[PDB]
Amino acid sequence: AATDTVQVGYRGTAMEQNYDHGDLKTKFAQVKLPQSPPPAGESPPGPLPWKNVQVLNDISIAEFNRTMIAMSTWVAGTGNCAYCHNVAAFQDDTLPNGKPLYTKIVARRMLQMTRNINGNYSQHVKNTGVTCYTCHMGKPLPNGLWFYSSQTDYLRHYLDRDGARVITQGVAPSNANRSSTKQAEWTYALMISQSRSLGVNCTYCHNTRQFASWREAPPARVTAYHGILMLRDVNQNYLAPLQPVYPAVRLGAMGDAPKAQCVTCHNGAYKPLYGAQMAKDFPAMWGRADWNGVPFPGI
Amino acid sequence: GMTEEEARRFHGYMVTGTLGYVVVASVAHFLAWSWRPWF
Amino acid sequence: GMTEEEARRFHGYMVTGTLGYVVVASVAHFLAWSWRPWF
Amino acid sequence: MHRIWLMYDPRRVMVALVGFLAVLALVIHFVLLSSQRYSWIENGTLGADQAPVGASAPAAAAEMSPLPPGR
Amino acid sequence: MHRIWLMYDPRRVMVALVGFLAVLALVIHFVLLSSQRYSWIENGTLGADQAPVGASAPAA
Amino acid sequence: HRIWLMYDPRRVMVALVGFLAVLALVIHFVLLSSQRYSWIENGTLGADQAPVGASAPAA
Amino acid sequence: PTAWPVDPTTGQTLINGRPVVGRVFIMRKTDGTVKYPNVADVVAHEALAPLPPVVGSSYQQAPITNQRRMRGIMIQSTLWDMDRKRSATRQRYYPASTPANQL
Amino acid sequence: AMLSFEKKYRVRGGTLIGGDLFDFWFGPFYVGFFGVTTIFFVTLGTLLCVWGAAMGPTWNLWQINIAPPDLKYGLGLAPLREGGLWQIITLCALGAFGSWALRQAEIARKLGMGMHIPWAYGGAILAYTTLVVIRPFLLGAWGHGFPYGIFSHLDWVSNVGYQYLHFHYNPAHMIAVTFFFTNCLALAMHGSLILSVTNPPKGTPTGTSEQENVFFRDLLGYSIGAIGIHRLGLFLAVGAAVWSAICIVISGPFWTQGWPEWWNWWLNLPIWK
Amino acid sequence: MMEYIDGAQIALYAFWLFFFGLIIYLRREDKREGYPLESPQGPRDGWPKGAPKKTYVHRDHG
Amino acid sequence: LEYQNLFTRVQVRTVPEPGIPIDESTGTRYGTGTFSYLAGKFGDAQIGPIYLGWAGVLSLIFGFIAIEIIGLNMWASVGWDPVEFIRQLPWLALEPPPPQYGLRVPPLNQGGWYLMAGFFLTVSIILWWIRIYRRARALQMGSHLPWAFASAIFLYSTFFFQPLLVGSWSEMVPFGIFPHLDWTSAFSIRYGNLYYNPFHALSIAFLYGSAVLFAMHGATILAVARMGGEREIEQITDRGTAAERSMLFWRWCMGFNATMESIHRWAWWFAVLTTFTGGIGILLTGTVVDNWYLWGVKHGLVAPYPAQNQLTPEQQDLLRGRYQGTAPDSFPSYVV
Numbered sequence A: 001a002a003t004d005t006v007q008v009g010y011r012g013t014a015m016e017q018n019y020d021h022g023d024l025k026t027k028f029a030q031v032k033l034p035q036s037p038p039p040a041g042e043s044p045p046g047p048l049p050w051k052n053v054q055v056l057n058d059i060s061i062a063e064f065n066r067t068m069i070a071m072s073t074w075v076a077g078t079g080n081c082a083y084c085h086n087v088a089a090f091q092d093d094t095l096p097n098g099k100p101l102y103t104k105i106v107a108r109r110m111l112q113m114t115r116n117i118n119g120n121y122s123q124h125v126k127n128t129g130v131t132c133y134t135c136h137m138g139k140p141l142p143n144g145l146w147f148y149s150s151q152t153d154y155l156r157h158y159l160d161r162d163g164a165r166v167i168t169q170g171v172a173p174s175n176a177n178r179s180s181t182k183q184a185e186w187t188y189a190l191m192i193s194q195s196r197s198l199g200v201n202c203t204y205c206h207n208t209r210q211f212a213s214w215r216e217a218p219p220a221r222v223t224a225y226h227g228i229l230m231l232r233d234v235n236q237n238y239l240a241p242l243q244p245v246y247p248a249v250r251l252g253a254m255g256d257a258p259k260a261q262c263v264t265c266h267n268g269a270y271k272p273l274y275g276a277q278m279a280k281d282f283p284a285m286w287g288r289a290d291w292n293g294v295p296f297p298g299i
Numbered sequence B, C: 001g002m003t004e005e006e007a008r009r010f011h012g013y014m015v016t017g018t019l020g021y022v023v024v025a026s027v028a029h030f031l032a033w034s035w036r037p038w039f
Numbered sequence D: 001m002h003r004i005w006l007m008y009d010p011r012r013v014m015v016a017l018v019g020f021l022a023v024l025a026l027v028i029h030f031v032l033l034s035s036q037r038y039s040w041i042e043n044g045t046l047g048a049d050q051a052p053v054g055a056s057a058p059a060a061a062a063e064m065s066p067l068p069p070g071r
Numbered sequence E: 001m002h003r004i005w006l007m008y009d010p011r012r013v014m015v016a017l018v019g020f021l022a023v024l025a026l027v028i029h030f031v032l033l034s035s036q037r038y039s040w041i042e043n044g045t046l047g048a049d050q051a052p053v054g055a056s057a058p059a060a
Numbered sequence F: 001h002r003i004w005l006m007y008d009p010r011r012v013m014v015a016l017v018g019f020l021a022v023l024a025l026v027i028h029f030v031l032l033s034s035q036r037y038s039w040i041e042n043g044t045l046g047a048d049q050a051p052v053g054a055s056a057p058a059a
Numbered sequence G: 001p002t003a004w005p006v007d008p009t010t011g012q013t014l015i016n017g018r019p020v021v022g023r024v025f026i027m028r029k030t031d032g033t034v035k036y037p038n039v040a041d042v043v044a045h046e047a048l049a050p051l052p053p054v055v056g057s058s059y060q061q062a063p064i065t066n067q068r069r070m071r072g073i074m075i076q077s078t079l080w081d082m083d084r085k086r087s088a089t090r091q092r093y094y095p096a097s098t099p100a101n102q103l
Numbered sequence H: 001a002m003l004s005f006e007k008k009y010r011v012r013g014g015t016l017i018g019g020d021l022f023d024f025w026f027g028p029f030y031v032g033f034f035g036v037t038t039i040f041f042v043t044l045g046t047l048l049c050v051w052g053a054a055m056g057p058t059w060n061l062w063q064i065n066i067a068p069p070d071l072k073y074g075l076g077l078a079p080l081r082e083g084g085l086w087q088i089i090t091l092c093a094l095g096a097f098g099s100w101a102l103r104q105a106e107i108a109r110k111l112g113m114g115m116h117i118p119w120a121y122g123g124a125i126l127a128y129t130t131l132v133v134i135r136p137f138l139l140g141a142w143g144h145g146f147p148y149g150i151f152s153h154l155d156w157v158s159n160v161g162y163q164y165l166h167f168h169y170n171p172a173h174m175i176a177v178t179f180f181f182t183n184c185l186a187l188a189m190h191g192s193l194i195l196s197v198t199n200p201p202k203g204t205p206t207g208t209s210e211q212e213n214v215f216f217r218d219l220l221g222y223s224i225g226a227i228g229i230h231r232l233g234l235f236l237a238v239g240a241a242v243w244s245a246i247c248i249v250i251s252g253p254f255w256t257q258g259w260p261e262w263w264n265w266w267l268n269l270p271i272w273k
Numbered sequence I: 001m002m003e004y005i006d007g008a009q010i011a012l013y014a015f016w017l018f019f020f021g022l023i024i025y026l027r028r029e030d031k032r033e034g035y036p037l038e039s040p041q042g043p044r045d046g047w048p049k050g051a052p053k054k055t056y057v058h059r060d061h062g
Numbered sequence J: 001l002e003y004q005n006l007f008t009r010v011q012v013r014t015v016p017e018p019g020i021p022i023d024e025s026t027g028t029r030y031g032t033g034t035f036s037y038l039a040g041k042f043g044d045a046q047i048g049p050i051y052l053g054w055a056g057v058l059s060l061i062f063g064f065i066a067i068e069i070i071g072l073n074m075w076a077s078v079g080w081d082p083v084e085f086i087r088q089l090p091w092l093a094l095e096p097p098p099p100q101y102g103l104r105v106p107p108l109n110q111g112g113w114y115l116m117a118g119f120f121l122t123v124s125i126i127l128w129w130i131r132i133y134r135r136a137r138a139l140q141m142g143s144h145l146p147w148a149f150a151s152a153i154f155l156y157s158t159f160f161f162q163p164l165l166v167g168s169w170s171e172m173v174p175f176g177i178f179p180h181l182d183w184t185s186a187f188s189i190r191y192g193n194l195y196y197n198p199f200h201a202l203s204i205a206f207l208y209g210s211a212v213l214f215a216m217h218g219a220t221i222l223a224v225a226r227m228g229g230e231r232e233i234e235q236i237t238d239r240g241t242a243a244e245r246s247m248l249f250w251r252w253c254m255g256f257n258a259t260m261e262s263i264h265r266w267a268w269w270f271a272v273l274t275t276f277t278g279g280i281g282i283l284l285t286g287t288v289v290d291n292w293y294l295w296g297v298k299h300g301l302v303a304p305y306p307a308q309n310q311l312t313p314e315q316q317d318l319l320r321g322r323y324q325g326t327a328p329d330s331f332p333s334y335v336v
């Protein structure tokens, strides 16, 4: 019955996070023990021998080989190069049978996506960043995959919709805001989803005397808003257009590709992997010229 | 109220009931110990 | 209704019972200490 | 100490005794059934060396924290 | 022994007992039914080697 | 010995038993909630293996 | 202007040119709290007012199998994220429905 | 000054503590030992509230806010300007409310009344003690108490509710609300009935218990009767405060997740899992 | 065009004037028994002065 | 240990059960009196005959059809599955129309049943008021009860008039156990925290005061019930020592007292003002004030806290969102 509490606002306001101490130790231990250790960093020189490399063109051969080892443990198991490749012919994008190696096609796009996350959305992922492990956890399927269902599904806030505000920024009613109480119910549904996706309550991002207020809210609300912008880019530009690549068994009932949401990275924790920092160890994935001052190797 | 004759008679049924219970309970504990010791 | 005889007799049982309990508990602490000392 | 049977109606002492033993039995069973080590309905067939033991010390990585940063 | 049925009403104790066994039996069945090992309505046809077992101690 | 004149044994005995029953149950659950003496889960650890709380850092 | 001048002779604060015996601190109310003057001042610390809604110019009705039976707005969070009984899941949407001459 | 019938009731005796020493009146008020301790704690607590207002940012009544300490202080007394003052005021409050209930017991004993009023008030004291003593103690820091300020304590209520995402789904809170609403309905009916028999339309005779009983029985189908409605009103009003104490003490110490997901047990009953 | 004065504020003072009127009325009703008060300085009425004691017409026979 | 008057060990029964005294026309008493032992142990024992008349009969017909429409729409929403109808019952709703209809008649499935159930429920409540009013007159009683009930109906009607005044039936309360609580929470979110609505604050003060008073008055009458204090009409017409002692208890405690009659006026007004101040607070919401916290900032209700974050000027432009619009009515492919 022991409870841990974190204060996140001013002392009288009851802006606090509560954790069941025992249940949190179980979650935290179940992350730490599977957390795959990175291989050692190394680099000899030499011009690139690769035949069919489009993304990893800016990386030494040793750092490239190191990356492929990491990718296998993070997505498929530590020696499972057969998950993506025709093992005899790594440059191939097809099987000996001629059929496309759809997994390798996806993985190439996932590398571009990861660089785009780490590079363009540092306002969200900062110096923690993401790697393949952040979503995949060692398995081919991440959590929180979603598909088209109904028009009013709130997860479409992370794809093609925009706008969740409902509160008036003035005392009197006006033509500027005609939001329905039903629309406040819809935002409330969306916000419960976000809260659960992080394992936090509303006071983590709001002072609930004014949900609209930014000044009264913790700084985490600003980070959260960039996460919404990031998911829209991730879903629209990378995950959704993989629809013609997957086998039909991976598609939704509408035949749409699987899409991501906050829980896909966070998995119920306030930071993914409780803030474990791996992206700094893998310059292949930075999309940045330096990581926290450590410069990009650049051959 | 209660006589000593009943009070002494009754205590004999208490002791045999108690001993039977403790005998069963201690067999049950030693079975549990053999299966999965707690020290 | 109490009497000094009833009181004096009952005092013997309370004293001896209390001390016997404290003896059994002292062994329990001896066992607990030998298994996992708290100082 | 058999004078304890003079102090109370023996029928009621048996009712109280049976209640106390029954409740204490259920308390200890559900405590054990909630534990990892003695969840016997799921793990009863595990050998004594295979049965769970509570960790002596969890590890950590210095950047990780189980709780969010506070104020 | 039998003089206990002077001290207590047989007619009454039997109802208390029969009610207690009904409650106890139902509780034990529902505890088993919601386990993994003994969810016999779904998995009762599995052999004893094939039935679920709770997660073991081995760990890093 | 005359304290038993001031208090009825039929009350005292239950009051004393009730105190001891509560106190014993409190101490067991306090220990069970500790890390060092969570004996249901960890009682098979040796005395050197059993948890110990954090020390003074000296720095 | 975070602090008053210090006398180089003695390391001693000067207020309005004259010394103060002690360690001068700038007085503030509890935790530096300051009363809100105005709605306008509160609003000036906020983000700008939200942009206008994007409303659809016309409505296309969804396929009937994409239409929810339950019109309650929050049910996706308050029930369906914890409820995953198969029969209850199947009931969430209207079933397929086809003109008989198209079978 | 005294009511026209009062003087013969102003006897000595019935005190719990102090005897004749404080057994006297001041105007309408009975004093007594617990009257003296009441005034002490009321005065000390009220002046420390004024001191809290003085060192805060405004004298505006609605905006005064004497806040508890940061959670980091745990169960210790914090610095007085950092929430230790809220802790001292809380001790005065506990002393004042306890003294008030014991003074009520002395008054009731002096009048030969039953102890119903002191114990009914104990229900409210239990809720206050839950909010500032028991729940913060179970959470391990006094900073979980609510702040003393007419609107800032409503900000606390708002934020505590949203700590559980959707506090309406708290099952003890639903019961507590039902008692509060049912109490207010029952109070309107009891008031109306007594007034309507004692103040009938002009030229009508004064009503009777029989008419009250008949009318009530057409409202609910059954007769509650005279003592029954006062038992009900007491059960409803005090049960509302007791279930309030339960609903807040389970929120945090025992349940930490959102309240909607507590209802998962109902969805998984074996007859329909 | 009054900036500070708004309908919610106007309504709230309307209520306060009614409510303080209501408390006065109830305190007049509360004094129909036991008043005027006895005092060593003679009778006292408090404030407001109480409404007079009612006389109740009993049911004529039954 | 002293007898607490909370439970009656010895009930008495009369072989005949009392009937209704007078005015039997346009309506008649249904049933006949019977005794409940449990109700007779809480309070008085007779479960009675009951009165309806024209207004009562019509009220039940309208109210039955309203409840029948609510239940059948709930049951239709789980596909007529009777197990899910029970399992999911508190989540089920009959839901208001969509917002873009405004006050127009909506489609039958999309809130047309809602408005129909709401209409019959409203008529049923008004007929039940007429019943209570007529029955008070027929028993030769004051009309204090129907005016108390009118105050509750006033609050209820604001859940029609405020949606009317903001111009859309979509703003109405869904019929459903948890759904109407979802609406209650979302209403406070939309209108910027209802804690700062001063009529909501007044309504709470009267809701709490009603609990304070019934606790105080209930306890007071039980504390003197050993002296016949519960015979309140007799104590009002013929003041006994039970009334004198309850007046003195409160005078000596808190410095002033009521009478055995006038305490029931305090009770009546505190209950009535709960729903009356509540209704006013609803009617002002969205019509006069659209954000109650900002109204509280304007009028000086809002306690200052130190800032938890500060925005840069470009963040003030970046972090403004959009007001929520329509749901997407297509399923986009992203193939190109």
Ligand SMILES: CCCCCCCCCCCCCC(=O)OC[C@H](COP(=O)(O)OCC(O)COP(=O)(O)OC[C@@H](COC(=O)CCCCCCCCCCCCC)OC(=O)CCCCCCCCCCCCC)OC(=O)CCCCCCCCCCCCC
Residues within 6 Å of the ligand: H001, H002, H026, H027, H028, I020, I021, I023, I024, I027, I044, I045, I046, I047, I048, J205, J209, J254, J255, J256
């Ligand atoms: C929020 C919504 C719900 C909120 C719900 C709030 C409900 C509150 C209801 C109760 C309030 C009235 C309390 C009361 O009547 O006490 C008796 C006392 C004296 O009159 P008396 O009892 O008939 O006669 C005895 C007296 O004449 C002689 O007695 P004695 O010689 O033995 O003792 C000395 C005197 C000295 O007089 C005083 O000290 C009176 C000081 C009263 C100050 C508090 C006024 C509060 C008004 C609140 C309403 C509103 C004011 C704006 O008598 C006494 O010692 C009597 C001591 C009585 C102590 C009463 C303390 C009550 C504190 C209540 C605080 C409530 C805060 C909310 O009465 C008074 O002094 C006058 C009260 C008049 C009724 C209030 C009407 C206000 C209407 C608006 C202003 C009208 C201006 C013309």
Ligand code: BCL
Residues within 6 Å of the ligand: C016, C019, C020, C021, C023
């Ligand atoms: C009515 C009898 C008396 C009494 C009379 C004696 C006598 C006589 C002797 C002891 C002895 C002892 N008693 Mg004794 N003892 C009493 C109550 C107690 C209580 C208690 C909780 O009240 C305790 C802890 C003890 C403890 C002890 C030990 C220090 C010691 C060894 C036996 C033993 O462990 O017995 C634990 C206690 C019990 C099981 C209950 C008490 C009665 C039983 C029968 C034991 C003592 C008698 C012993 C077998 C006699 C042996 C023959 C003699 C050596 C000639 N006694 C009662 C009140 N005790 C012996 C001694 O001094 O050895 C150094 C000894 O000769």
Ligand code: BCL
Residues within 6 Å of the ligand: H157, H181, H184, J067, J070, J121, J125, J152, J153, J155, J156, J175, J183, J184, J185, J186, J187, J188, J193, J194, J195, J199, J200, J203, J204, J205, J207, J274, J275, J277, J278, J279, J281, J282
């Ligand atoms: C997040 C939620 C919001 C919030 C949102 C609202 C909203 C929205 C409303 C209230 C309202 C009220 N709130 Mg608020 N409330 C919150 C926090 C609180 C807290 C607290 C400790 O935090 C409290 C004590 C209260 C207390 C109160 C009450 C004082 C008030 C209702 C009075 C009443 O009697 O209603 C109960 C009485 C009725 C509903 C009257 C009903 C009478 C009719 C005639 C009955 C018909 C029955 C019929 C015949 C049969 C039906 C059959 C079925 C249809 C099947 N709120 C927060 C800030 N609150 C109301 C109000 O007045 O606001 C100003 C209101 O509308």
Ligand SMILES: CC[C@H]1c2cc3[nH]c4c(c3C)C(=O)[C@H](C(=O)OC)c4c3nc(cc4[nH]c(cc(n2)[C@@H]1C)c(C(C)=O)c4C)[C@@H](C)[C@@H]3CCC(=O)OC/C=C(\C)CCC[C@H](C)CCC[C@H](C)CCCC(C)C
Residues within 6 Å of the ligand: H038, H041, H042, H043, H044, H045, H046, H049, H089, H092, H093, H096, H097, H100, H117, H118, H120, H121, H122, H123, H124, H147, H148, H149, H150, H151, H153, H237, H238, H240, H241, J208, J211, J212, J215, J216, J219, J253, J254
């Ligand atoms: C248990 C059911 C309900 C209940 C019942 C009840 N209340 C009662 C009684 C009963 C039976 C009394 O006999 C007693 C009484 O005498 O009433 C006249 C009382 C009473 N209920 C009161 C109020 C009250 N009851 C409330 C609630 C309830 N009372 C329950 C809902 C509330 C709520 C919900 O807000 C309030 C405000 C008082 C009028 C009175 C108790 C008077 C008393 O204790 O007097 C002595 C103390 C003082 C006069 C002042 C103390 C000042 C402090 C030392 C300093 C201030 C500290 C405080 C914590 C600050 C709070 C600031 C707020 C803005 C947060």
Ligand SMILES: CC[C@H]1c2cc3[nH]c4c(c3C)C(=O)[C@H](C(=O)OC)c4c3nc(cc4[nH]c(cc(n2)[C@@H]1C)c(C(C)=O)c4C)[C@@H](C)[C@@H]3CCC(=O)OC/C=C(\C)CCC[C@H](C)CCC[C@H](C)CCCC(C)C
Residues within 6 Å of the ligand: H181, H182, H184, H185, H188, H189, H219, H220, J057, J059, J060, J061, J062, J063, J064, J067, J124, J125, J128, J129, J132, J145, J148, J149, J151, J152, J271, J272, J274, J275
């Ligand atoms: C002063 C404010 C408080 C208050 C007061 C109040 N309410 C009241 C009253 C009063 C004074 C009444 O006199 C009135 C009443 O009747 O009380 C018993 C009522 C009332 N308060 C009610 C509820 C209520 N009050 C609430 C609240 C409150 N009421 C406030 C707290 C709430 C809340 C908190 O939400 C509720 C839910 C009702 C119990 C009652 C009004 C009953 C009514 O209007 O019923 C209309 C009829 C129906 C809905 C139909 C029922 C149909 C059945 C299924 C039977 C069908 C039989 C048959 C099939 C049909 C007929 C066939 C013919 C051939 C005969």
Ligand SMILES: *[C@H]1O[C@H](CO)[C@@H](O[C@@H]2O[C@@H](C)[C@H](O)[C@@H](O)[C@H]2O)[C@H](O)[C@@H]1O[C@H]1O[C@H](C(=O)O)[C@@H](O[C@H]2O[C@H](CO)[C@@H](O)[C@H](O)[C@H]2NC(C)=O)[C@H](OC(C)=O)[C@H]1OC(C)=O
Residues within 6 Å of the ligand: A052, A092, A093, A094, A095, A096, A097, A098, A099
């Ligand atoms: C999978 O298929 C692709 C081509 O579809 C092969 O990719 C080769 O390498 C790329 C760099 C280049 O861009 C591409 O054009 C192609 O040269 C890939 O190596 C895999 O090849 C195997 O399957 C091929 C296939 O498509 O079926 C197959 O190709 C032969 O057969 C097809 C079908 O009849 C015919 O259209 C091709 O022209 C023919 N190609 C050749 C080079 O013979 C490959 O068979 C052979 C002998 O190469 C398969 O690869 C092997 C080693 O067997």
Ligand SMILES: *[C@H]1O[C@H](CO)[C@@H](O[C@@H]2O[C@@H](C)[C@H](O)[C@@H](O)[C@H]2O)[C@H](O)[C@@H]1O[C@H]1O[C@H](C(=O)O)[C@@H](O[C@H]2O[C@H](CO)[C@@H](O)[C@H](O)[C@H]2NC(C)=O)[C@H](OC(C)=O)[C@H]1OC(C)=O
Residues within 6 Å of the ligand: A160, A161, A162, G054, G055, G056, J325, J326, J327, J328, J329, J330, J331, J332, J333, J334
């Ligand atoms: C399907 O159509 C609906 C309805 O347009 C789209 O939802 C819109 O966008 C959401 C932000 C909003 O919630 C919703 O109210 C509605 O405004 C939905 O996202 C799907 O969009 C795709 O199809 C759109 C369509 O209506 O045909 C198409 O829109 C563009 O094309 C139409 C027809 O030529 C033209 O009338 C529109 O003005 C035009 N809109 C824009 C913004 O250019 C979308 O194309 C684009 C670029 O938005 C489609 O979206 C995608 C990613 O394919």
Ligand SMILES: COC(C)(C)C/C=C/C(C)=C/C=C/C(C=O)=C/C=C/C(C)=C/C=C/C=C(C)/C=C/C=C(\C)CC/C=C(C)/C=C/C=C(\C)C(=O)O
Residues within 6 Å of the ligand: B006, B009, B010, B013, B014, B016, B017, B018, B021, D021, D024, D027, D028, D031, E001, E003, E004, F024, F025, F028, F029
């Ligand atoms: C795991 O964590 C936590 C839980 C925290 C750890 C801690 C746990 C704690 C603190 C436990 C404490 C345990 C305890 C402490 O005392 C336990 C004490 C247990 C006891 C005393 C058991 C006694 C049992 C006695 C029985 C069964 C007797 C039966 C008698 C019968 C049947 C005979 C009836 C009469 C008959 C037949 C005939 C009469 C004839 C007559 C009259 C005639 O013929 O006339």
Ligand SMILES: COC(C)(C)C/C=C/C(C)=C/C=C/C(C=O)=C/C=C/C(C)=C/C=C/C=C(C)/C=C/C=C(\C)CC/C=C(C)/C=C/C=C(\C)C(=O)O
Residues within 6 Å of the ligand: C006, C009, C010, C013, C014, C016, C017, C018, C021, D001, D002, D003, D004, D007, F009, F020, F023, F026, F027, F030
């Ligand atoms: C861990 O963290 C925290 C918890 C914080 C740490 C702190 C802990 C603290 C503060 C602990 C305090 C402990 C304490 C303090 O006092 C503990 C005190 C303990 C005591 C007093 C124990 C006494 C036990 C006595 C017993 C068992 C008596 C048995 C008697 C028997 C068997 C005989 C019965 C007699 C009969 C039947 C009569 C027959 C004759 C008759 C009838 C006749 O003759 O008539």
Ligand SMILES: COC(C)(C)C/C=C/C(C)=C/C=C/C(C)=C/C=C/C(C)=C/C=C\C=C(C)\C=C\C=C(C)\C=C\C=C(C)\C=C\CC(C)(C)OC
Residues within 6 Å of the ligand: J067, J068, J070, J071, J072, J075, J115, J116, J118, J119, J122, J156, J157, J159, J160, J172, J173, J174, J175, J176, J177, J180
């Ligand atoms: C077979 O029979 C079955 C089994 C179906 C019978 C069982 C039925 C069951 C189980 C029913 C369950 C009902 C439940 C659980 C209902 C819950 C209701 C709740 C909690 C309601 C709460 C609040 C509702 C409110 C406040 C609604 C207010 C609505 C109003 C004021 C509507 C007014 C509408 C009007 C006046 C409409 C007028 C018509 C127009 C505008 C068109 O013309 C004037």
Ligand SMILES: CCCCCCCCCCCCO[C@@H]1O[C@H](CO)[C@@H](O[C@H]2O[C@H](CO)[C@@H](O)[C@H](O)[C@H]2O)[C@H](O)[C@H]1O
Residues within 6 Å of the ligand: D014, D015, D016, D018, D019, D020, E008
């Ligand atoms: C040899 C066996 C002979 C037949 C035995 C029959 C056993 C019947 C069931 C025994 C257990 C019932 O459960 C036990 O009931 C007693 C009845 O007083 C309760 O006893 C307690 O509560 C009851 C009310 O419930 C009070 O009136 C009583 O004063 C108090 O001691 C115990 O708290 C409870 O644990």
Ligand SMILES: [Fe+3]
Residues within 6 Å of the ligand: H190, H194, J217, J221, J232, J264
């Ligand atoms: Fe009354």
